[PDB]
């Protein structure tokens, strides 16, 4: 009895503190306020809701023999839990979609979505989750012949619906569990091809004349497009960060970069900044097999970790409920509670595996924890 209560309280505390730290950090520093971080904030909020209102309350009901808090509390908690779970899944899928669209349509996407549009998408996903789950359960409880589950049980009565239960489960995980996979696979392919075509482009740049390069860049910049200005702004504002990576670059060819800067001394910002930030990135990430292979391996490992974690933690329920309306009483009731806990477990690891990786939170959260 002690083990069950000790393996649940610690998990709940970990999830709650992890998500609360992210939520505070998003409003504790001005550096993470970037629009790209809103999806992370929504995901952290959904995970916090799960960890603060479901894990503890489910452990309470599992420890004792019944959710004796009444027919109101049971239904309301159940609806809140399912809404939060689908909110987490939708936020993960949206993060995947943004990741895919940020590497295949760089200029177009970056220039075709600012602030409100992102908040609009997040709200749309939240509303989709709420409309899909929250209404149906309680409206069915009101419109069914009678609320007939058990005097002390809390499992949803919708579980016995071959056209609904299977349908809902598919539309909730079977679709995103494959869309995420396809999108991330395409991202891996396009980052391999990106390295290849960057190396080829860098070689051509090395062969190409410099004066023609400057003339072409100036001509392209003059015909300002909706997104070219945004790309110029991003590159110029990031340039100090890029230069820091120059030290990471080998000194074997530092003469080339120094010379290129020397001739680029004129045209201070419009040409020098972009030209250097382009040559440096090309040299550093095209290079040869030595660096390209390491980069692709690192990307693939990170992608595989992120995917596999969710895919393996969120299947202890999907398949067991797919069989449920397929093999009558095929599962042991003692096992059901394990997948139930595994879903929450996913909701716990998720902030750790999505937010810390950015490495701007990696130190900010620790500094906030130390209070200094």
């Amino acid at each position: 009895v002690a083990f069950i209560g000790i393996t649940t309280g610690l998990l709940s505390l970990a999830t709650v503190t992890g998500n609360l730290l992210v939520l505070i950090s998003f409003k504790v520093n001005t550096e993470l306020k970037t629009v790209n971080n809103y999806f992370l904030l929504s995901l952290a909020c959904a995970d916090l809701i799960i960890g603060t209102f479901s894990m503890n309350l489910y452990t309470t009901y599992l420890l004792m023999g019944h959710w004796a808090l009444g027919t109101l509390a049971c239904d309301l908690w159940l609806a809140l839990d399912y809404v939060a779970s689908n909110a987490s899944v939708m936020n993960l899928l949206l993060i995947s979609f943004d990741r895919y669209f940020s590497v295949t349509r760089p200029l177009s996407y970056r220039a075709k979505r600012t602030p409100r549009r992102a908040a609009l998408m997040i709200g749309l996903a939240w509303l989709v989750s709420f409309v899909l789950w929250a209404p149906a359960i309680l409206f069915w409880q009101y419109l069914v012949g009678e609320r007939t589950v058990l005097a002390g049980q809390c499992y949803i009565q919708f579980l016995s619906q071959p056209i609904i239960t299977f349908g809902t489960a598919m539309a909730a995980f079977y679709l995103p569990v494959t869309v995420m996979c396809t999108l991330y696979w395409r991202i891996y392919r396009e980052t391999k091809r990106a390295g290849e075509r960057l190396a080829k482009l860098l070689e051509k740049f090395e062969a190409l004349p410099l004066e023609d390069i400057v003339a072409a860049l100036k001509a392209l910049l003059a015909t300002n497009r909706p997104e070219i200005q945004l790309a110029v702004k991003t590159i110029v504002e990031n340039f100090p960060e890029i230069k820091k990576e120059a030290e990471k670059l080998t000194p074997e060819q530092k003469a080339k970069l120094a010379a290129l800067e020397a001739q680029l001394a004129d045209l201070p910002e419009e040409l020098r900044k972009v030209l250097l930030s382009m040559y440096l990135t090309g040299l550093l990430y095209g290079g040869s097999e030595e660096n390209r292979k390491r980069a692709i391996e690192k990307a693939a490992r990170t992608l595989s970790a992120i995917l596999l974690a969710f895919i393996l933690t969120w299947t202890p329920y999907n398949i067991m409920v797919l069989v449920s309306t397929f093999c009558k009483d095929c599962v042991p009731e003692t096992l059901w509670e394990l997948g139930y806990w595994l879903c929450y477990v996913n909701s716990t690891i998720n902030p750790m595996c999505y937010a810390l990786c950015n490495k701007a939170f990696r130190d900010t959260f620790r500094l906030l924890l130390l209070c200094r």
Binding site: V103, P106, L107, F205, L208, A216, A231, T234, A299
Partner: peptide, 27 residues
């Protein structure tokens, strides 16, 4: 020249792509 400008645009697009990958720590 036209082709040169096209290549320059491709290069700047690729630079933005590398920046975007860096910002996700998914490099």
């Amino acid at each position: 020249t036209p082709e040169n400008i096209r290549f320059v645009f491709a290069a700047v697009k690729d630079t933005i792509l590398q920046l975007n990958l860096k910002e996700y720590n998914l490099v």
